[PDB]
Design a protein around this ligand. Structure first.
Ligand code: HEM
Length: 110
């Protein structure tokens, strides 16, 4: 099956490399990017992100709910447009399908 866990790991490397300040909103704030895999808070976030991707593909994802929760952290359209770019890179590096359609669904509620 598609190694979405590896995709998500690359996605967060790309995201925080380009926008390090985004990391400050997480429980792994301040942690070196190259060490995130050994961080408990990151492990949980990465898993939830993978789950969301599998939910989007499976048809169960609550994009409105996810959008609302991100607004609840002051994360909106600008951030998700930036994320769309990083995720496209991560998917391409793994021969995985692009997830732009899934991010657009979230953007439609932001
Ligand atoms: C590909 C785009 C993204 C996906 C699929 C995604 C997915 C998720 C998911 C599934 C959760 C957990 C929601 C829950 O527990 O109900 C979450 C939480 C969160 N996301 Fe995102 N996210 C994305 C982009 C971003 C970006 C760009 C930021 C910028 C700061 C961000 C910030 C956060 C924060 C701060 C939380 C809460 C973390 C916590 O509870 O400690 N996300 N995200």
């Amino acid at each position: 099956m598609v190694n979405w866990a590896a995709v998500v790991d690359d996605f967060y490397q790309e995201l925080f490399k380009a926008h390090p300040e985004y990391q400050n909103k997480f429980g792994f704030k301040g942690v070196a990017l190259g060490s995130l895999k050994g961080n408990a808070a990151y492990k949980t976030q990465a898993g939830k992100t993978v789950d969301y991707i599998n939910a989007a593909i499976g048809g169960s994802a609550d994009a409105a709910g996810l959008a609302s929760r991100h607004k609840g952290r002051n994360v909106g359209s600008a951030e998700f447009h930036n994320a769309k770019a990083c995720l496209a890179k991560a998917c391409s590096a793994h021969g995985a399908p692009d997830l732009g359609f899934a991010i657009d669904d979230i953007l439609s509620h932001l």
